[PDB]
């Protein structure tokens, strides 16, 4: 189980993480902010498929994984 979050979206942009997450596989609990969305994304999803995903829907250097067990 771990955590996704990206900093580089602006107020709208937040669903459109959670959202191609949301389109590629099932999220768990995305949040919103000005521009740093935190997805969940589990140990059994698209998470590499994310890391180069959303950070492609981003940029390459606001992007992390941080566990939340």
Known sequence: ???IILSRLKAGEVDLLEEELGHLTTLTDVVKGA???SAILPGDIAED???AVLCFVIEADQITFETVE
């Open 1 to 3: 189980p771990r955590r």
């Open 35 to 37: 521009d740093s969305l």
């Open 49 to 51: 498929d994310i890391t």
